[PDB]
Amino acid sequence: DFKLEKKEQYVYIETDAPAFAGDVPAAFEETARSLFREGYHSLIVNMQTVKSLDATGITTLKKVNYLCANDLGMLAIVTRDDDFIDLLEDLRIPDLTVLPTKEEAIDAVFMHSLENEFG
Known part of the structure; x- marks a missing residue:
């Protein structure tokens, strides 16, 4: 279950998940796609608690990022872990x-x- 902060330009998404894998990336992709059809081109997700990924998680991450870029937005990830x-x-x-x-x-x-x- 993700926490959402809805703003005008972007959505801020939080997760407590220790790892991005299993049914989690499918859940995130569902949340992301529902926000996309609401007009949102940009997503900020807080992954600070996520220490690991799986194959599905990467492809999901790749896809959501593409859908963001194609709308002239972007996908930002927030973590302190180096x-x-x-x-x-x-x-x-x-x-x-x-x-x-x-x-x-x-x-x-x-x-x-x-x-x-203005780029």
């Missing part, structure tokens, strides 16, 4: 952004928006 950032960045997902804090993730989302028009 080796987890090394893992996510090793996925070679081009527009995937990993940031230490929520305030920084929100900055990135709005920066991206500005980057479209």
Whole structure:
């Protein structure tokens, strides 16, 4: 079960899950796709508690990120853990952004928006 903060530009999603795997990525993808059809182009998820991934989790992560980018938005991930950032960045997902804090993730989302028009 995810906690949602709905704003105008973006959605902030939280999870307590220790690992992204099993029925979790399918659940997240369901939540993400429902928010997409509500008009949201940008998602910020807090993965700080997630220490590991599976095959499904990566493809899900890849897909949600693509759906965000295609809407001219982006998918931001929030975690302080360093080796987890090394893992996510090793996925070679081009527009995937990993940031230490929520305030920084929100900055990135709005920066991206500005980057479209004035980049």
